[PDB]
Amino acid sequence: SGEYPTVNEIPVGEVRLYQIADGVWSHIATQSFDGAVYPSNGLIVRDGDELLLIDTAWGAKNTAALLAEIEKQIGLPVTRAVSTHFHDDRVGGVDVLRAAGVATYASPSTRRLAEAEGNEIPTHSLEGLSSSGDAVRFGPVELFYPGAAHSTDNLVVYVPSANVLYGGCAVHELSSTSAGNVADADLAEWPTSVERIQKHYPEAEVVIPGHGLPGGLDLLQHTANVVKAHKN
């Protein structure tokens, strides 16, 4: 009923959308992994009479449900998708997208890591993102590579029309007390990568983490703090 969706308010197998700004939504879904249940976020950005999708809904059936929820709530076609790193909460569902005619994209780094992991692999490679601080335009967003953080390949996404910063899994929600799933992280580089985000996007009004509740710019410093304490 208008609050940011959580596992307790998303019916089983379902996806919810949340309006972030004009022409910007997040998508929220639930998945189990190693016997625990987690929410995860992605983004939807209106691109004229089409939609750009950022990240899958973490799984094939969740991603099919995402497409249905978009049709119900928005009614514009998803034409392109970008995955912001190689983990299954970002690429799991890419095959569903591709069979629904969505063109799927990721950096070459992400595509290599996904292939090596046995995860689904986006079709198209996003060049121009291989050095930290790199940025490229992609429809109504800017893609930015801040350096290694949650993963070596993680990308962040900025929606300039709305000053929305989608941090993905490099950014944690304010209530978080741990650095999440760090198996592929660089805890030493992570603060430096966050500082790059902070420097590059000082006008961000909304910051969206990969998992949990959106907030403001404070999510960035909070993330650096949680990571530093995990590392120690």
Q: Residues at the annotated binding site for Zn(2+)? A: 85, 87, 89, 125, 127, 150, 169, 211
140 touches which of ligand XB4, Zn ion, none (CB within 5 to 8 A by kind)? none
Question: Taking CB positions, which residue lies at the least distance from ligand XB4?
Answer: 180
| 16: Cβ contacts below 8 Å, ≥ 6 apart | 5, 9, 10, 27, 28, 29, 69
Whether residue 220 contacts residue 171, with contact meaning beta carbons closer than 8 Å, is answered with yes
Supply the residues annotated as catalytic.
85, 87, 89, 150, 181
Q: Does 59 participate in binding ligand XB4 (rule CB under 6 A)?
A: no
User: How far is residue 50's CA from residue 60's CA, in Å, rounded to a whole number?
Assistant: 22
Whether residue 91 contacts residue 56, with contact meaning beta carbons closer than 8 Å, is answered with yes
15 touches which of ligand XB4, Zn ion, none (CB within 5 to 8 A by kind)? none
The contact set with Zn ion (CB under 5 A) reads 87, 89, 169, 210
Residue ranges at the known binding site: 85, 87, 89, 125, 127, 150, 169, 211
Tokens found for residue 210: 């990969």
Which range binds ligand XB4 by CB under 6 A, 3-11, 155-163, 208-216, 219-227?
208-216
Q: Does 89 participate in binding ligand XB4 (rule CB under 6 A)?
A: yes
Provide the CB-side half-sphere exposure for 98 (13 A, CA).
13
